[PDB]
Ligand binder design. Structure first.
Ligand SMILES: O=C(O)[C@H](O)[C@@H](O)CO
Length: 322
């Protein structure tokens, strides 16, 4: 039975921890079901560092995986080892990123849509004027770079909005908290903070400074959703992120690849946008540290692939009630 290896370029935020947890739960079940024989997760430590991930992938290849799932630390640094994996007969699914690795299959989300849903409604909620802080995501990664360009583009459409600081948050609340706290004493009143699923941490910085909580971009986790409700935050705050369960979809892709099935080289799967009407539904199911994730079954995966191939309607997976 196949050996599925997963190499993850950054583990220092809760989204990535949910992404691993969902993969490991799905893999464990696949193993019990006799669909796979073995699975392994390896995380590169540090602030999204490609050099150690490349080394880790080479150590994984020595164990002869049948498929390798990769969340890449860099848009470019993994290309040679990806080709090395393919040359050794390994099926390679790059997920939660789009990179120019010709032998790999790409399974991503629309980072552009995410960045737009995080920035545009937030700027509208402050009347297209005022002061904002930009908190960047997983700097060094391809999705972060794409989203930052998108955020700047949207900001350019609102001339009366001033960026009073840019910092790096790594889509991690505590990291964002620390970086924002660092600049608050030096800046004018802040109307919004456009970040990467870090709004709970951003909010704590403002609370520590005794300043009113701006419009923020929350984590799609249980704790942020509850904070949003319990303080009845009604100030333009939003909750949108990519799907951590891209890892589970990548598992199903790998297994289909391993039995000779054809997949598109590029696949766009859906992000997780939590509009007001969906908050309580998600909050009912998510543990505090658990990020919202689509429950991909092998069948739901195949449906989405069929929609992609045929250009049909994106599958809108169901919010789990359990
Ligand atoms: O760590 C994260 O939040 C994710 O990888 C995003 O940067 C891309 O979906």
């Amino acid at each position: 039975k196949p050996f599925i290896a997963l190499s993850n370029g950054f583990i220092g935020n809760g989204w990535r921890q949910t992404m691993i947890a969902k993969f490991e739960e799905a893999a464990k079940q696949a193993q019990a079901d006799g669909l796979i024989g073995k699975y392994k997760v390896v995380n590169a430590p540090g602030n999204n560092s490609a050099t150690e991930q490349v080394a880790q992938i080479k150590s994984l290849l020595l164990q002869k995986p049948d498929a390798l799932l990769i969340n890449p630390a860099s848009p470019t640094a993994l290309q040679p080892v990806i080709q090395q994996a393919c040359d050794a007969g390994v099926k390679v699914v790059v997920f939660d990123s789009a990179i120019d690795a010709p032998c790999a299959y790409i399974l991503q989300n629309s980072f552009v849509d995410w960045a737009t849903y995080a920035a545009k409604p937030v700027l509208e909620s402050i009347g297209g004027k005022g002061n904002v802080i930009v908190v960047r995501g997983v700097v060094g990664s391809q999705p972060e770079a794409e989203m930052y360009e998108t955020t700047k583009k949207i900001l350019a459409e609102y001339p009366q909005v001033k960026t009073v600081a840019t910092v790096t948050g790594m889509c991690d609340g505590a990291t964002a908290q620390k970086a924002v706290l660092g600049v608050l004493p030096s800046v004018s009143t802040v109307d919004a903070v456009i970040g990467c699923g870090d709004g709970y941490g951003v909010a704590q910085a403002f609370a520590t400074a005794g300043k009113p909580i701006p419009a923020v971009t929350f984590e799609t986790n249980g704790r942020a959703l509850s904070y949003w409700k319990d303080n009845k935050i009604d100030n333009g705050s939003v909750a949108v992120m990519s799907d951590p369960a891209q890892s589970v979809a990548a598992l199903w892709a790998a297994l289909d690849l391993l039995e000779g099935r054809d997949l598109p080289k590029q696949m766009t799967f859906p992000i997780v946008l939590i509009e007001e009407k969906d908050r309580d539904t998600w909050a009912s199911v998510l543990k505090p540290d658990e990020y919202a994730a689509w429950p991909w079954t092998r069948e739901l995966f195949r449906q989405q692939v069929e929609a992609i191939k045929t250009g049909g309607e994106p599958v809108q997976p169901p919010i789990p009630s359990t």
